[PDB]
From a paper:
Ubiquitination of lysine residues is a major histone modification that regulates various genomic processes such as transcription, replication, and DNA repair. Histone H2B monoubiquitination (at Lys120 in humans) regulates transcription elongation and DNA repair. In humans, H2B monoubiquitination is catalyzed by the heterodimeric Bre1 complex composed of Bre1A/RNF20 and Bre1B/RNF40. The three Bre1 proteins share a C-terminal RING domain, which is required for the ubiquitination of H2BK120 in humans and H2BK123 in yeasts.
Thus, we created two atomic models of the RINGA-RINGB complex bound to the nucleosome based on the obtained density. In Model I, RINGA and RINGB bind to the acidic patch and DNA phosphates, respectively, whereas in Model II, the two RING domains have opposite orientations. R953A and R978B (Bre1A and Bre1B residues are indicated with superscripted “A” and “B,”, respectively) in Models I and II, respectively, form salt bridges with H2AE61, H2AD90, and H2AE92. R955A in Model I and R981B in Model II also form salt bridges with H2AE61 and H2AE64 at the position of the so-called variant arginine type 123. In addition, the side chains of K936A in Model I and K962B in Model II are located at the interface with H2B, possibly contributing to nucleosome binding by forming intermolecular interactions. K962B, R979B, R981B, and R982B in Model I and K936A, R953A, R955A, and K956A in Model II face DNA phosphates. Meanwhile, the results of our mutational experiments also showed that when Bre1A-type mutations (G974TB and A978TB) were introduced, RINGB could function as the catalytic E3 enzyme. The Bre1 complex interacts with the nucleosome in two possible orientations of their RING domains, and H2BK120 ubiquitination occurs only when RINGA binds to the acidic patch.
Residue numbers in the entry:
A (entry chain B): 20 to 101
B (entry chain F): 22 to 101
C (entry chain A): 37 to 134
D (entry chain E): 36 to 134
E (entry chain H): 30 to 124
F (entry chain D): 29 to 124
G (entry chain G): 8 to 120
H (entry chain C): 9 to 120
The structure:
Amino acid sequence: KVLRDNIQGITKPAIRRLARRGGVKRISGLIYEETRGVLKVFLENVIRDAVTYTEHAKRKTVTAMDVVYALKRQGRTLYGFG
Amino acid sequence: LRDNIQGITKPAIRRLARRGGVKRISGLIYEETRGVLKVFLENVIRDAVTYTEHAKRKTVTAMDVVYALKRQGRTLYGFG
Amino acid sequence: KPHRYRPGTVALREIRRYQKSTELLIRKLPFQRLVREIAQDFKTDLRFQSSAVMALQEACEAYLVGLFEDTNLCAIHAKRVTIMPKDIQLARRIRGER
Amino acid sequence: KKPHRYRPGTVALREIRRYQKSTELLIRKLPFQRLVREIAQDFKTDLRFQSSAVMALQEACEAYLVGLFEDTNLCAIHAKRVTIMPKDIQLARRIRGER
Amino acid sequence: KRSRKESYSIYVYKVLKQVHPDTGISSKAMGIMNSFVNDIFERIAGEASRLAHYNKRSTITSREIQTAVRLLLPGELAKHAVSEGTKAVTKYTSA
Amino acid sequence: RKRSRKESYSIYVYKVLKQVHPDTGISSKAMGIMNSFVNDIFERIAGEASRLAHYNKRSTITSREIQTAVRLLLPGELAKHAVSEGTKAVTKYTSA
Amino acid sequence: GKARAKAKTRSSRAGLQFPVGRVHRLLRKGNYAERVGAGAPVYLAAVLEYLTAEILELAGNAARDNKKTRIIPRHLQLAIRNDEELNKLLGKVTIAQGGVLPNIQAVLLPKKT
Amino acid sequence: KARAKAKTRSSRAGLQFPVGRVHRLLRKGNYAERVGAGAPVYLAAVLEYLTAEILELAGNAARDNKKTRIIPRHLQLAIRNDEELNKLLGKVTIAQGGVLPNIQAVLLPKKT
Amino acid sequence: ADADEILQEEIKEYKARLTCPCCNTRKKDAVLTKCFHVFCFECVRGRYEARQRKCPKCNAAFGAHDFHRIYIS
Amino acid sequence: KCDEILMEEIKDYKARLTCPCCNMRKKDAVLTKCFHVFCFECVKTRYDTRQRKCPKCNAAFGANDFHRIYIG
DNA sequence: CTGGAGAATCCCGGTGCCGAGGCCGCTCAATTGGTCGTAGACAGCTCTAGCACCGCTTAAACGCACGTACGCGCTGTCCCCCGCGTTTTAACCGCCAAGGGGATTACTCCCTAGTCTCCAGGCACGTGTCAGATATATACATCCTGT
DNA sequence: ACAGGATGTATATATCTGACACGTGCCTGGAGACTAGGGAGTAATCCCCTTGGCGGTTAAAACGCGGGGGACAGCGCGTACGTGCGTTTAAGCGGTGCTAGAGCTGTCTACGACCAATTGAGCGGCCTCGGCACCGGGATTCTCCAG
Ligand SMILES: [Zn+2]
Ligand SMILES: [Zn+2]
Ligand SMILES: [Zn+2]
Ligand SMILES: [Zn+2]
């Protein structure tokens, strides 16, 4: 099975909630599409690094270790997963 | 050595802004730029002096400076 | 007689309730599907641990919240209370993402 | 009669072009060296500096201030301004992560 | 056989009970703590390795760790960590 | 007082420049820039490959760790071109 | 002769809760240097234990005022973000399930006419 | 006593960059307790390719500046005019390289 | 009939040398100032983006702005 | 009506490979200041008459600024 | 400028639940006690360059005059986003179920550390010489006043 | 929108001048050749645990609408900053001179690796009860319209 246009799954209320946690009062209507774009770019970078780490390990499953290494790679060190 | 931050003169800061593509500069820019420059020098020089102190040296070499810059994600080329 | 709050007050209430809370603000299945779509764009026939997807969601939510904080600061800088795509672009380019 | 006077901004644009085409140091060397020694004596008294160390510090500070002024100009343009104000530098530094 | 993994969980819990006798901790918080300890250990050890390489030293001593702590940790935290490390090294030297 | 011995990539950078720009010279400052760049990229690839070997509990760094480190660190099409060049050199080295 | 001491951990010799032996082993197997001194694991374990004690004290303080006797990642996040010095130590680090520090820009508050 | 005279591993792989020096630095840099035979070859190839790319771009900039000698300004222009090579060295500053000449469009004269 | 065939043949010959050898799909609008040969702008832009800084036919090395768009019409 | 487009197609292509001024020979020269294409002998003869300006866009150029090209 | 009505939130308390923490068993890695090698601390010497002062020149900083353009406050207007009710929808939980491959073990082989000798690749030094600033002398691209 | 006057900038030739490119002598760091032993590649197994489906349901998303409050264009002003000019300052360049400390070298010793025996710390599994989530209701607090 293949997956398409799941970037729309990051919905408008979800982006509004994320902005609320970021202390944003008013949100323009064009914020959402740019948020999909930038989140997609960030996910492409992180997932590409994680997939490269998985490919090096001869593995066909992306573990939390690969994601943690990809995050500590990009100056985005993540705690609580190993 | 006292009050050498004013040695970073107003026209020098304007020249720096011109290289940064700044067309108009406020008069209050210069003092705050001197302050942030002082902060940057404090960080870099503190790291460089720590590197020098570890080597049991009393001279701050250029390699200590480039190590200090590389520590702060500001890698500099041309000094080793 | 219907009761309505003036605009912004409910938004402030959501700001407070989502800054007090810590749970994920994105639905789990759509984000998992997006991650799997990007992964199969990179490498086909791929499997994901649940902890890996949760870590990716934590990282993406943290990144988006920080980006929205910087975007909000950009909005205040331009004497605005609403954020615009120019605010996001300016924040990203200052952070070095562009 | 009528001595020549460039309009405000075109001289500034000419300096922008000149200092973006050129590569030399924009701060006089002796005052910056004195500033470096002033800041360094607060960490270790009786300290010596290699000359190349001072040039490396000067290059780093030139680059940092040029990038900071680039971000400052972008912040000023974002606020629909062509002049840079201290709040522009504060916003740029806080987004960059120093503040 | 059976998988075996090591963590700073018991050490973090002992430190917590030393500093907060009547306070608990969750599994997720303990994971945060373990990740923090490994991250700081990696940073300090890598910095000490870099000092050893720069100074051509083939060994990592307490001087390298102290310099790494001074370089990485900020300000008053670095000062307290340096004092604690020196105290522990002097105590270990006697015993 | 004797004379020391300092290693550098200066002659290698000069050979590469001569094989890519036969009639173009390089200044000493630019040579220093190039040597610093080579050292930085070398240490970066080596550190990433060391971390890769540590993650996989592997005691040796082979061509595959450098493969992964180049695919990671180098961006865009630099990555795939350096992959092609490295695989070409490895094949030519194993053949001879 | 066989007359020897039973055991005496280096952590107890240095008066540390953190393991000097495990830190020494990780230093040896981390390929940091060809050799590791005797006092290097002691110093590193002391520094790690001090940092752990600081962050755990702050986290317990954050948990106490929340009527919770059990530290959660939210308490750790609050402890790190309130302490600007630990915050700058861990500026580029994100904590899972920690949320964010509650703050709102002063201009976003209601005008209250 | 019969043996082959000499053949550097850089010459075997057709590389200008030193495979032997890279191998020695890989062992001496404390990266792993073992280093494979093909790892320095591949790393030298990658370093040589990056050197060739940056040097070709710098020489192109030098020719466009009517100079036959590469200066740090030419290297800086080569880095900043190539997006991939720019973001490979995004957090890297070059001594005496200057900056890429650009002016924001709002700063240009209004032509009024 | 013969005249139409000859005209179609020479039109095909015109199509042969008016189209970029690298692409052979659509018309040339650019020149490299190193090899003095005409190509189309986005093919050489892709080659530069593909980090292939060699001319498709003579393999001459060209820079970032050694190619510029040609105003044929 | 297919043939009606045919000589219309001829006049469109035949116009744009020939010199804008001479209008009788294929273009084989360029001007890099104005980014325009002329033929070789026209720019030779119009350079020899000491007028260094582009006939259509009025761009000044030097001797080394214009050169032979292979349009084909 | 508040009263009061409506709605969101805090607090108090009972109850169940699931995971935090204590305990037990085991096992493997940290400890102890030696040997042996060599890394570095330690004194001594050399000599490179860092520092300090001096004087002349002139580039640059500085203080001021004056104009102008733009930063900012105010006004209008207007339209886009927020609050909210309703309908849809697919997220989420539970349960089931298959099998994919992560992880571990065992075996073998080949690849790399280690050694010894050897030689030539590269570095330090020296020296010719030539892009290259550095001037003038001449021919266009803007800037600004003016109509 | 268009002269033109002036200002600045882009090309075309002599001329020195250190810096750069090439030639030499070492010498020590890579290359050849060979050993040996451990790291890892490969085959096999098994058992987590990941993926996929089905069903309930229900919280959340999507939709549409009213309106109000913020975005933005425009206007006015006044002041802060740009530009130019005369003045003063100190940066820069060179030259000398002194020596402090970088850098290197020889001793040797005292730490760090290595290794055999072992044992006590630390991890996996079990289990229990209590901290906490949740439900539910009242009291408190915030918001907003209408006086
Ligand atoms: Zn083409
Ligand atoms: Zn060609
Ligand atoms: Zn013609
Ligand atoms: Zn023209």
